[PDB]
A paper describes a structure:
Addressing the elusive specificity of cysteine cathepsins, which in contrast to caspases and trypsin-like proteases lack strict specificity determining P1 pocket, calls for innovative approaches. Hence, we set out to determine the crystal structures of cathepsin complexes with representative peptides of cleaved substrates. Reactive site mutants C25A and [name] of [name] were used in structural studies.
The pattern III group (binding shifted to the primed side) consisted of structures of eight non-protected peptides that all bound uncleaved into the primed sites. In molecule B the electron density maps enabled the unambiguous interpretation of two further residues, P5′ and P6′, of the peptides AVAEKQ and [name]. The first notable exception in the primed site binding was the peptide [name] with deviation at P4′, where the side chain of Ala was placed instead of H-bonding to Q145, and at P6′, where Pro formed electrostatic interactions with its carboxylic terminal to the amino group of K20. On the non-primed side, the MPD molecule occupied the S2 site, and the CL- anion occupied the same position as the carbonyl oxygens of P1 residues in pattern groups I and II. Their ionic interaction at a distance of 3 Å is visible in the crystal structure of [name] - [name] complex.
Residue numbers in the entry:
A (entry chain PA): 443 to 447
B (entry chain AA): 1 to 221
Write the structure that this text describes.
């Protein structure tokens, strides 16, 4: 998954 | 088996990359394992193209920016007979048209090796004797997002339901007792800025924490 940022 | 291993100190790991807003951690993990295997075989470290993988492995089951799997990527490198370098096929973080150009190939794999699922010792073994190992983990937690240092241990971690592929570049322990407070040295793809220089230490031998040993594998070069 992707960074929350 | 050694007490600690750090493939980065031996030249098998490229600088930390950033997948940005695209679900290709699986491609990063794949290129990490491959970069390490190609290094062991030639003594040359070459950043591989994750974009190559995003755009061309839909036939093997990958979905570009919407998920994918590391072994499926090794699978594509094999059917395709190659994989371009990052320099020749740059990462743009979006699903694009496959532009694999074999004149720019710099890596090859004839298949892959799997690690028995949930077997941390098999994993430790693969790590210690082969080089960085692509692994899947459950990274759906704020604590992971905000991780900064030390050994990561999250109680709500799953060892079965994974959403993120990373790379185990080694392992070790904290302190002097080699048999305790052990961790997996993990390379992420959220940039150098996330975590500890882009890495995370994850609890080892703590019941396959976050599923790190659930579906590990590495490419055969
Ligand atoms: Cl992802």
């Amino acid at each position: 998954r992707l960074s929350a940022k | 088996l050694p007490k600690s291993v750090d493939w980065r100190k031996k030249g098998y790991v490229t600088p930390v990359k950033n997948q940005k807003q695209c679900g290709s951690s699986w491609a990063f993990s794949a290129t990490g394992a491959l970069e390490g295997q190609m290094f062991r075989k030639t003594g040359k470290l070459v950043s591989l193209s994750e974009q190559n993988l995003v755009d061309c492995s839909r036939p093997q089951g990958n979905q570009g920016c919407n998920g994918g799997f590391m072994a499926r990527a090794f699978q594509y490198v094999k059917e395709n007979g190659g994989l371009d370098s990052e320099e020749s096929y740059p990462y743009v973080a979006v699903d694009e048209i496959c532009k694999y150009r074999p004149e720019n190939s710099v890596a090859q794999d004839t298949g892959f090796t799997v690690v028995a699922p949930g077997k941390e010792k098999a994993l430790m073994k693969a790590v210690a004797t082969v080089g960085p190992i692509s692994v899947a983990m459950d990274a759906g937690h704020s604590s992971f997002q905000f991780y900064k240092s030390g050994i990561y241990f999250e109680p709500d971690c799953s060892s079965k339901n994974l959403d993120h592929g990373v790379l185990v570049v080694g392992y070790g322990f904290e302190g002097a007792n080699s048999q305790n407070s052990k961790y997996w040295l993990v390379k992420n793809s959220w940039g150098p800025e996330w975590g500890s220089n882009g890495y995370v230490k994850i609890a080892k031998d703590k019941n396959n924490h976050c599923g790190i040993a659930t579906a590990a594998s590495y490419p055969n070069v």
